[PDB]
């Protein structure tokens, strides 16, 4: 039975292709993050004691790192997701040039949010 | 039988324009039908056609089929069969509207009718003012036509054996053609397709030359198969060299460029076509425009550069808008293969081997013809031809622009339209014996066993160079006699050529060797014929016989394969709906 | 100047699995050539090398290849666009399709998705034209950028969504053809067509990755086409 | 069918984008995050409802989305149905657990 060339490592991918493979990853990650975020939010409400116990957890550097990633993943999914929707509604052109241009602006808008995320967590 | 047998009413060898129309038609007529093709149907040469289809639709200005019949008969230099040409031009319009109804995406006039453009050899009132009757889709018409015909075959659930290579015809002990053997390219399996009607529709053979507008797959397979079957070929010396191929590339730029307002310039910037053809100018017959450009070069009035000797084709004055709208195809072609942007600078062109006027002689029905010992016509039972592989002949010694596509459709249709009566008329054919089938395989078996023979690469190159230097636009008696001798030599070398790749899973090498056999037979029948015709008519141009000889050569030449000798057939000059156009002096 | 290639090889009767083989070609320094030129010449030196090609002018769509990681046609990719000092020119089959032999893939599923969208004019025969169907230049333009497709398989074989569901997703090439009949004024089956494209896979598997656009040798834009199809689909079922 | 998914996903996206703006709104302008200003925010009817509304939105949005992913990568029918079962129960838990957390504040 026959072989197929699907060796992902031997293929060029444009910035637009990167843009959405990340959108997919960021989405799956956010799905997990919601349970983790809920588990935390639940703690920080049950009692005055639980809240201290939570902001204690948020003190840990290892936690602060994860928390920033989680927020950066969500940041990305939102920005790139709005980019997507903008095409679906005709505010963005579906040409290749316009795809590259918007994929870049997405990345920049995300890096700026990612920082403002670290600042919120530091 | 030690070989699978696949039986059909009709087997159509070839899936380009003519073959797909014929398949489509035969099928809707009740009969079973196998469509064979050595490439995927939409990769056939027809896809590369640009200009459009010539047909008296009368959309652009009021027209008349007889005007078109005149243009053709004159363009053919009076060896086109008038009864068939009458059939074509007259039927044309309906056959072409039929395509539009199949969805073919033609370009449009303001009122919403099929766009038509001026083209080479098109007059009103029997040789009058210039006409514009070539219906087109931009300059991608061939592409539009072929893809439409495929979809029509898809819709119609036609049986298509894609990427199967027809080897050779199969003859019953009565001399009737009862199908053919074919090699499945993917798996390597060899099968016998058994048919009451084998329709050859294998296209041209421009690859017997060194430079051609033809695709790599145009290797005259049909001519070879026919010759080896004992079936004569006709007018094989009439090879049309398109005036404007891209210099140093061979890739065609459409005659639509000149039909839209472009003209040819030489090194001094003279529109030299007004000299060679006062009335029609750059839209004169093709054989004429070809020679003119070649003369301009042959006297140091040609231009030069990285492309080689060439003439300049000027378009820029039509404006970016018109170029991008009416001729976007040659924009990419000229940019890609000439590094010239036709919007600013002229395109470097030179006549290039383009279309094969010759081929298997047929009646309008599509039935293949041979001659008996008395020289009279006889029908080859079971054999048919349509398209470029056929010589009907509607093009005589020079084909008109847009007239090939018309041909494909009209005669592909006709062949199917008349297939029932053809089969009934020929009567039941006796079965092929096992050794009859075994014979077809001989050619293939040789290659499969020859390991230490000659290099086919060198043999092909020798062949092409030979035809290029000896049977090009201008011919002389000496060269042709020597070319012919070198061919005999080259052809000996080939009987001992080697198949370096022995495998069976998609072995393209075996195919290309099988093809070379046909390049050979074709090249040979062409050379033997070009010698034979001791005059000058249409494309055929001899220095040692510069005059058109209507007393001895108002006829077709016929190449008898068994005796490797030449002979003649009458040109028909009896239309049915109007009086024949008498042969007169032909100038543009 | 010398040219170095690394080409995908595979023959079921000999090769246990596929493999990359090295090739060298002496190239006329001054002149530039097309990849297909090289391929044809390599075959003279090694007659076993199988690939497809016909028109050699970028129209037939035969010779689609993954060249240096990206899809395109050998007959119109210049050597000078693939050549970089110190690295071999890497040539592999189009991604995702079964490999028959060497650089030849099995286009089966590609054609299959094409037929699925019923790629032929469907006119119900009412109000027939006196002669040709009358189509105003304005309407005819809507076909532009759609009818020129050469079914070369470049776009679809570079689309992940097609990789994962080559038989449920139509792919760029196909959806382009579908739209080509969806906006043909002469086609009277527009709604029936749309109803066949309303499931979750046919059209909607597309995320706007835009690989399709960047590879099309005819410069067509399957992304925009699929865009229009989605509008029509919402217009109809929303 | 597909047109339904297409719309539902994008609808829930708009809702969730509004929720995020509102939640980032609070965070960006509150300063001293004492246990009291935190619990006060989450006692508000607006915050309770918006949050539950947001949780439903995830249920729908995330389910559609995760389904698309699975049907690209997870071929075997058994394994896939199993993964969907988890993913869905997980999502439903999310909404229920939220109903338990906020209702009690
Ligand atoms: C070369 C060319 C010709 C051309 C043109 C542009 C170019 C570059 N533009 C034209 C135009 O605008 N108007 C017009 O009237 N003619 C134009 N031409 C000429 C015209 O295209 C050709 O004359 C015409 O296309 C010939 O069509 P036909 O149907 O006769 O031939 P084909 O399309 O090449 O089809 C050949 C088929 O046969 C199969 N085949 C060949 N050998 C075999 C074997 N051995 N076994 C099985 N099948 C075989 C091929 O697979 C193909 O399907
Ligand atoms: C809050 C939790 C969220 C989760 C768990 C989530 C998850 C997902 C998942 C799994 C996908 C499918 C990925 C793919 O098809 O590759 C997806 C796609 C998408 N996401 Fe979200 N998302 C969330 C919030 C948001 C928000 C706030 C937006 C607003 C932009 C958004 C916008 C989108 C859009 C527009 C798609 C469309 C993908 C498509 O079907 O083409 N998501 N998301
Ligand atoms: O599955 C995917 C793969 Cl392999 C790639 Cl490379 C990309 Cl770009 C995307 Cl969007 C998906 Cl979903
Ligand atoms: O010039 C063309 O477009 C083409 O060459 C036309 C014919 O007829 O062959
Ligand atoms: S749309 Fe473009 S890339 Fe896709 S098959 Fe057609 S020509 Fe090829
Ligand atoms: S590369 Fe594929 S997902 Fe869509 S825009 Fe493209 S067809
Ligand atoms: S060979 Fe025809 S497309 Fe490249
Ligand atoms: Na002919």
PDB file of C-alpha atoms in Angstrom, chain B residues 151-346:
ATOM      1  CA  UNK B 151     -17.462  18.586 -17.758  1.00  0.00           C
ATOM      2  CA  UNK B 152     -19.978  17.594 -20.402  1.00  0.00           C
ATOM      3  CA  UNK B 153     -18.423  14.137 -20.414  1.00  0.00           C
ATOM      4  CA  UNK B 154     -18.509  14.090 -16.591  1.00  0.00           C
ATOM      5  CA  UNK B 155     -22.157  15.055 -16.561  1.00  0.00           C
ATOM      6  CA  UNK B 156     -22.853  12.400 -19.130  1.00  0.00           C
ATOM      7  CA  UNK B 157     -21.064   9.633 -17.203  1.00  0.00           C
ATOM      8  CA  UNK B 158     -18.758   8.796 -20.105  1.00  0.00           C
ATOM      9  CA  UNK B 159     -16.367   5.859 -19.563  1.00  0.00           C
ATOM     10  CA  UNK B 160     -12.872   7.382 -19.549  1.00  0.00           C
ATOM     11  CA  UNK B 161      -9.724   5.318 -19.324  1.00  0.00           C
ATOM     12  CA  UNK B 162      -7.322   8.024 -18.259  1.00  0.00           C
ATOM     13  CA  UNK B 163      -3.569   7.567 -18.660  1.00  0.00           C
ATOM     14  CA  UNK B 164      -3.696   4.493 -20.872  1.00  0.00           C
ATOM     15  CA  UNK B 165      -1.331   4.425 -23.828  1.00  0.00           C
ATOM     16  CA  UNK B 166      -2.622   2.937 -27.083  1.00  0.00           C
ATOM     17  CA  UNK B 167       0.091   0.724 -28.567  1.00  0.00           C
ATOM     18  CA  UNK B 168      -1.101  -0.434 -31.976  1.00  0.00           C
ATOM     19  CA  UNK B 169      -4.228  -1.224 -34.012  1.00  0.00           C
ATOM     20  CA  UNK B 170      -5.529  -4.797 -34.160  1.00  0.00           C
ATOM     21  CA  UNK B 171      -6.524  -6.305 -37.511  1.00  0.00           C
ATOM     22  CA  UNK B 172      -8.766  -9.306 -38.099  1.00  0.00           C
ATOM     23  CA  UNK B 173      -7.806 -11.805 -40.774  1.00  0.00           C
ATOM     24  CA  UNK B 174      -9.962  -9.754 -43.179  1.00  0.00           C
ATOM     25  CA  UNK B 175      -7.923  -6.595 -42.855  1.00  0.00           C
ATOM     26  CA  UNK B 176     -10.608  -4.855 -40.776  1.00  0.00           C
ATOM     27  CA  UNK B 177      -9.625  -2.907 -37.662  1.00  0.00           C
ATOM     28  CA  UNK B 178     -11.203  -4.525 -34.597  1.00  0.00           C
ATOM     29  CA  UNK B 179      -9.838  -2.453 -31.723  1.00  0.00           C
ATOM     30  CA  UNK B 180      -6.367  -1.905 -30.336  1.00  0.00           C
ATOM     31  CA  UNK B 181      -3.964  -2.889 -27.552  1.00  0.00           C
ATOM     32  CA  UNK B 182      -3.163  -0.373 -24.868  1.00  0.00           C
ATOM     33  CA  UNK B 183      -0.776  -0.120 -21.930  1.00  0.00           C
ATOM     34  CA  UNK B 184      -2.114   1.117 -18.599  1.00  0.00           C
ATOM     35  CA  UNK B 185       0.565   3.623 -17.571  1.00  0.00           C
ATOM     36  CA  UNK B 186      -0.043   3.421 -13.820  1.00  0.00           C
ATOM     37  CA  UNK B 187      -0.003  -0.372 -13.370  1.00  0.00           C
ATOM     38  CA  UNK B 188       1.792  -1.503 -16.525  1.00  0.00           C
ATOM     39  CA  UNK B 189      -1.003  -3.922 -17.406  1.00  0.00           C
ATOM     40  CA  UNK B 190      -1.589  -4.461 -21.124  1.00  0.00           C
ATOM     41  CA  UNK B 191      -5.098  -4.965 -22.470  1.00  0.00           C
ATOM     42  CA  UNK B 192      -7.011  -5.478 -25.710  1.00  0.00           C
ATOM     43  CA  UNK B 193      -9.821  -2.980 -26.257  1.00  0.00           C
ATOM     44  CA  UNK B 194     -12.257  -4.684 -28.620  1.00  0.00           C
ATOM     45  CA  UNK B 195     -14.501  -2.413 -30.670  1.00  0.00           C
ATOM     46  CA  UNK B 196     -16.728  -2.428 -33.740  1.00  0.00           C
ATOM     47  CA  UNK B 197     -15.409   1.086 -34.292  1.00  0.00           C
ATOM     48  CA  UNK B 198     -11.961   2.388 -33.393  1.00  0.00           C
ATOM     49  CA  UNK B 199     -11.879   6.170 -33.666  1.00  0.00           C
ATOM     50  CA  UNK B 200      -8.393   7.620 -33.863  1.00  0.00           C
ATOM     51  CA  UNK B 201      -8.259  11.121 -32.358  1.00  0.00           C
ATOM     52  CA  UNK B 202      -4.714  11.491 -31.228  1.00  0.00           C
ATOM     53  CA  UNK B 203      -3.864  15.033 -32.414  1.00  0.00           C
ATOM     54  CA  UNK B 204      -0.702  16.507 -33.968  1.00  0.00           C
ATOM     55  CA  UNK B 205       3.010  15.687 -34.212  1.00  0.00           C
ATOM     56  CA  UNK B 206       4.875  18.998 -34.066  1.00  0.00           C
ATOM     57  CA  UNK B 207       7.501  17.230 -31.961  1.00  0.00           C
ATOM     58  CA  UNK B 208       9.123  15.742 -35.037  1.00  0.00           C
ATOM     59  CA  UNK B 209      10.704  19.175 -35.266  1.00  0.00           C
ATOM     60  CA  UNK B 210      13.344  20.938 -33.235  1.00  0.00           C
ATOM     61  CA  UNK B 211      11.200  23.908 -32.384  1.00  0.00           C
ATOM     62  CA  UNK B 212       7.419  23.681 -32.077  1.00  0.00           C
ATOM     63  CA  UNK B 213       4.371  25.270 -30.465  1.00  0.00           C
ATOM     64  CA  UNK B 214       3.148  21.724 -29.712  1.00  0.00           C
ATOM     65  CA  UNK B 215       3.056  20.059 -26.302  1.00  0.00           C
ATOM     66  CA  UNK B 216       5.578  17.325 -25.446  1.00  0.00           C
ATOM     67  CA  UNK B 217       2.886  14.755 -25.983  1.00  0.00           C
ATOM     68  CA  UNK B 218       2.342  15.581 -29.679  1.00  0.00           C
ATOM     69  CA  UNK B 219       4.246  12.654 -31.106  1.00  0.00           C
ATOM     70  CA  UNK B 220       2.054  11.614 -34.058  1.00  0.00           C
ATOM     71  CA  UNK B 221       1.105   8.353 -32.319  1.00  0.00           C
ATOM     72  CA  UNK B 222      -1.913   8.106 -34.640  1.00  0.00           C
ATOM     73  CA  UNK B 223       0.166   8.380 -37.775  1.00  0.00           C
ATOM     74  CA  UNK B 224       2.505   5.647 -36.609  1.00  0.00           C
ATOM     75  CA  UNK B 225      -0.268   3.298 -35.558  1.00  0.00           C
ATOM     76  CA  UNK B 226      -2.000   3.803 -38.898  1.00  0.00           C
ATOM     77  CA  UNK B 227       1.133   3.330 -40.984  1.00  0.00           C
ATOM     78  CA  UNK B 228       2.034   0.139 -39.140  1.00  0.00           C
ATOM     79  CA  UNK B 229      -1.507  -1.045 -39.761  1.00  0.00           C
ATOM     80  CA  UNK B 230      -1.077  -0.579 -43.506  1.00  0.00           C
ATOM     81  CA  UNK B 231      -3.269   2.499 -43.622  1.00  0.00           C
ATOM     82  CA  UNK B 232      -2.146   5.325 -45.930  1.00  0.00           C
ATOM     83  CA  UNK B 233      -1.582   8.884 -44.748  1.00  0.00           C
ATOM     84  CA  UNK B 234      -2.215  11.980 -46.900  1.00  0.00           C
ATOM     85  CA  UNK B 235      -0.759  15.428 -47.660  1.00  0.00           C
ATOM     86  CA  UNK B 236       1.907  14.701 -45.030  1.00  0.00           C
ATOM     87  CA  UNK B 237       4.124  17.427 -46.454  1.00  0.00           C
ATOM     88  CA  UNK B 238       1.779  20.238 -45.619  1.00  0.00           C
ATOM     89  CA  UNK B 239       3.084  21.437 -42.263  1.00  0.00           C
ATOM     90  CA  UNK B 240       1.854  24.800 -41.088  1.00  0.00           C
ATOM     91  CA  UNK B 241       4.428  26.976 -39.378  1.00  0.00           C
ATOM     92  CA  UNK B 242       2.659  29.606 -37.301  1.00  0.00           C
ATOM     93  CA  UNK B 243       4.051  33.059 -38.086  1.00  0.00           C
ATOM     94  CA  UNK B 244       4.383  34.183 -34.457  1.00  0.00           C
ATOM     95  CA  UNK B 245       6.015  31.716 -32.051  1.00  0.00           C
ATOM     96  CA  UNK B 246       8.135  33.226 -29.260  1.00  0.00           C
ATOM     97  CA  UNK B 247      11.715  33.495 -30.464  1.00  0.00           C
ATOM     98  CA  UNK B 248      14.101  31.009 -28.811  1.00  0.00           C
ATOM     99  CA  UNK B 249      11.191  29.383 -26.962  1.00  0.00           C
ATOM    100  CA  UNK B 250       8.630  27.994 -29.408  1.00  0.00           C
ATOM    101  CA  UNK B 251       5.739  28.926 -27.127  1.00  0.00           C
ATOM    102  CA  UNK B 252       2.952  30.407 -29.275  1.00  0.00           C
ATOM    103  CA  UNK B 253       1.549  33.928 -29.090  1.00  0.00           C
ATOM    104  CA  UNK B 254      -1.886  34.103 -30.652  1.00  0.00           C
ATOM    105  CA  UNK B 255      -2.668  35.329 -34.157  1.00  0.00           C
ATOM    106  CA  UNK B 256      -5.299  37.142 -32.110  1.00  0.00           C
ATOM    107  CA  UNK B 257      -2.549  39.692 -31.419  1.00  0.00           C
ATOM    108  CA  UNK B 258      -2.663  40.787 -35.042  1.00  0.00           C
ATOM    109  CA  UNK B 259      -6.417  40.364 -35.233  1.00  0.00           C
ATOM    110  CA  UNK B 260      -6.774  42.898 -32.433  1.00  0.00           C
ATOM    111  CA  UNK B 261      -4.557  45.441 -34.186  1.00  0.00           C
ATOM    112  CA  UNK B 262      -0.933  44.374 -33.845  1.00  0.00           C
ATOM    113  CA  UNK B 263       1.505  44.416 -36.751  1.00  0.00           C
ATOM    114  CA  UNK B 264       4.925  42.984 -37.614  1.00  0.00           C
ATOM    115  CA  UNK B 265       8.059  45.167 -37.846  1.00  0.00           C
ATOM    116  CA  UNK B 266      11.573  44.396 -39.105  1.00  0.00           C
ATOM    117  CA  UNK B 267      14.939  45.743 -37.902  1.00  0.00           C
ATOM    118  CA  UNK B 268      14.293  49.071 -39.618  1.00  0.00           C
ATOM    119  CA  UNK B 269      10.814  49.478 -38.143  1.00  0.00           C
ATOM    120  CA  UNK B 270       9.034  48.857 -41.441  1.00  0.00           C
ATOM    121  CA  UNK B 271       5.601  47.285 -41.310  1.00  0.00           C
ATOM    122  CA  UNK B 272       6.847  44.849 -43.976  1.00  0.00           C
ATOM    123  CA  UNK B 273       3.550  42.975 -44.317  1.00  0.00           C
ATOM    124  CA  UNK B 274       1.995  45.816 -46.352  1.00  0.00           C
ATOM    125  CA  UNK B 275       4.623  45.019 -48.956  1.00  0.00           C
ATOM    126  CA  UNK B 276       4.149  41.240 -49.025  1.00  0.00           C
ATOM    127  CA  UNK B 277       0.349  41.385 -48.762  1.00  0.00           C
ATOM    128  CA  UNK B 278      -1.098  44.766 -49.770  1.00  0.00           C
ATOM    129  CA  UNK B 279      -4.750  44.082 -48.886  1.00  0.00           C
ATOM    130  CA  UNK B 280      -4.783  41.663 -45.918  1.00  0.00           C
ATOM    131  CA  UNK B 281      -1.478  42.994 -44.541  1.00  0.00           C
ATOM    132  CA  UNK B 282      -0.601  41.259 -41.263  1.00  0.00           C
ATOM    133  CA  UNK B 283      -3.747  39.159 -41.511  1.00  0.00           C
ATOM    134  CA  UNK B 284      -2.835  37.397 -44.777  1.00  0.00           C
ATOM    135  CA  UNK B 285      -2.699  33.602 -45.072  1.00  0.00           C
ATOM    136  CA  UNK B 286      -0.411  31.880 -42.561  1.00  0.00           C
ATOM    137  CA  UNK B 287       1.945  30.220 -45.017  1.00  0.00           C
ATOM    138  CA  UNK B 288       2.503  33.668 -46.560  1.00  0.00           C
ATOM    139  CA  UNK B 289       3.094  35.628 -43.382  1.00  0.00           C
ATOM    140  CA  UNK B 290       5.473  32.830 -42.323  1.00  0.00           C
ATOM    141  CA  UNK B 291       7.596  33.057 -45.466  1.00  0.00           C
ATOM    142  CA  UNK B 292       7.593  36.844 -45.405  1.00  0.00           C
ATOM    143  CA  UNK B 293       9.104  36.962 -41.903  1.00  0.00           C
ATOM    144  CA  UNK B 294      11.594  34.315 -42.975  1.00  0.00           C
ATOM    145  CA  UNK B 295      12.615  36.302 -46.055  1.00  0.00           C
ATOM    146  CA  UNK B 296      13.035  39.502 -43.995  1.00  0.00           C
ATOM    147  CA  UNK B 297      15.432  37.545 -41.791  1.00  0.00           C
ATOM    148  CA  UNK B 298      17.196  35.834 -44.686  1.00  0.00           C
ATOM    149  CA  UNK B 299      18.207  39.220 -46.022  1.00  0.00           C
ATOM    150  CA  UNK B 300      19.556  40.796 -42.830  1.00  0.00           C
ATOM    151  CA  UNK B 301      16.423  42.813 -42.127  1.00  0.00           C
ATOM    152  CA  UNK B 302      15.706  40.634 -39.071  1.00  0.00           C
ATOM    153  CA  UNK B 303      16.348  41.736 -35.487  1.00  0.00           C
ATOM    154  CA  UNK B 304      18.637  40.157 -32.952  1.00  0.00           C
ATOM    155  CA  UNK B 305      19.227  39.749 -29.238  1.00  0.00           C
ATOM    156  CA  UNK B 306      19.141  37.030 -26.550  1.00  0.00           C
ATOM    157  CA  UNK B 307      16.242  35.416 -28.447  1.00  0.00           C
ATOM    158  CA  UNK B 308      18.006  34.771 -31.773  1.00  0.00           C
ATOM    159  CA  UNK B 309      16.933  36.055 -35.204  1.00  0.00           C
ATOM    160  CA  UNK B 310      13.366  37.353 -34.994  1.00  0.00           C
ATOM    161  CA  UNK B 311      10.748  39.847 -36.151  1.00  0.00           C
ATOM    162  CA  UNK B 312       9.181  42.382 -33.784  1.00  0.00           C
ATOM    163  CA  UNK B 313       5.450  42.035 -33.001  1.00  0.00           C
ATOM    164  CA  UNK B 314       4.101  45.424 -31.800  1.00  0.00           C
ATOM    165  CA  UNK B 315       1.095  45.520 -29.448  1.00  0.00           C
ATOM    166  CA  UNK B 316       1.725  48.371 -27.018  1.00  0.00           C
ATOM    167  CA  UNK B 317      -0.460  50.802 -28.959  1.00  0.00           C
ATOM    168  CA  UNK B 318      -3.614  48.837 -28.152  1.00  0.00           C
ATOM    169  CA  UNK B 319      -3.331  50.043 -24.553  1.00  0.00           C
ATOM    170  CA  UNK B 320      -2.936  48.176 -21.275  1.00  0.00           C
ATOM    171  CA  UNK B 321      -6.698  47.960 -20.828  1.00  0.00           C
ATOM    172  CA  UNK B 322      -7.389  46.132 -24.094  1.00  0.00           C
ATOM    173  CA  UNK B 323      -4.347  43.892 -23.776  1.00  0.00           C
ATOM    174  CA  UNK B 324      -5.301  42.754 -20.258  1.00  0.00           C
ATOM    175  CA  UNK B 325      -8.899  42.252 -21.300  1.00  0.00           C
ATOM    176  CA  UNK B 326      -8.650  40.616 -24.752  1.00  0.00           C
ATOM    177  CA  UNK B 327      -5.138  39.045 -24.585  1.00  0.00           C
ATOM    178  CA  UNK B 328      -4.156  38.400 -20.952  1.00  0.00           C
ATOM    179  CA  UNK B 329      -2.769  34.985 -21.838  1.00  0.00           C
ATOM    180  CA  UNK B 330       0.034  36.131 -24.101  1.00  0.00           C
ATOM    181  CA  UNK B 331       0.813  38.799 -21.506  1.00  0.00           C
ATOM    182  CA  UNK B 332       1.927  36.060 -19.124  1.00  0.00           C
ATOM    183  CA  UNK B 333       3.500  34.020 -21.900  1.00  0.00           C
ATOM    184  CA  UNK B 334       5.563  36.881 -23.318  1.00  0.00           C
ATOM    185  CA  UNK B 335       6.656  37.987 -19.849  1.00  0.00           C
ATOM    186  CA  UNK B 336       7.525  34.455 -18.777  1.00  0.00           C
ATOM    187  CA  UNK B 337       9.305  33.088 -21.856  1.00  0.00           C
ATOM    188  CA  UNK B 338      10.578  36.300 -23.463  1.00  0.00           C
ATOM    189  CA  UNK B 339      11.080  38.570 -20.453  1.00  0.00           C
ATOM    190  CA  UNK B 340       9.198  41.150 -22.463  1.00  0.00           C
ATOM    191  CA  UNK B 341       6.184  43.106 -21.225  1.00  0.00           C
ATOM    192  CA  UNK B 342       3.989  43.525 -24.347  1.00  0.00           C
ATOM    193  CA  UNK B 343       2.406  46.607 -22.758  1.00  0.00           C
ATOM    194  CA  UNK B 344       5.694  48.503 -23.238  1.00  0.00           C
ATOM    195  CA  UNK B 345       7.853  46.635 -25.762  1.00  0.00           C
ATOM    196  CA  UNK B 346       7.250  44.456 -28.918  1.00  0.00           C
TER     197      UNK B 346
END
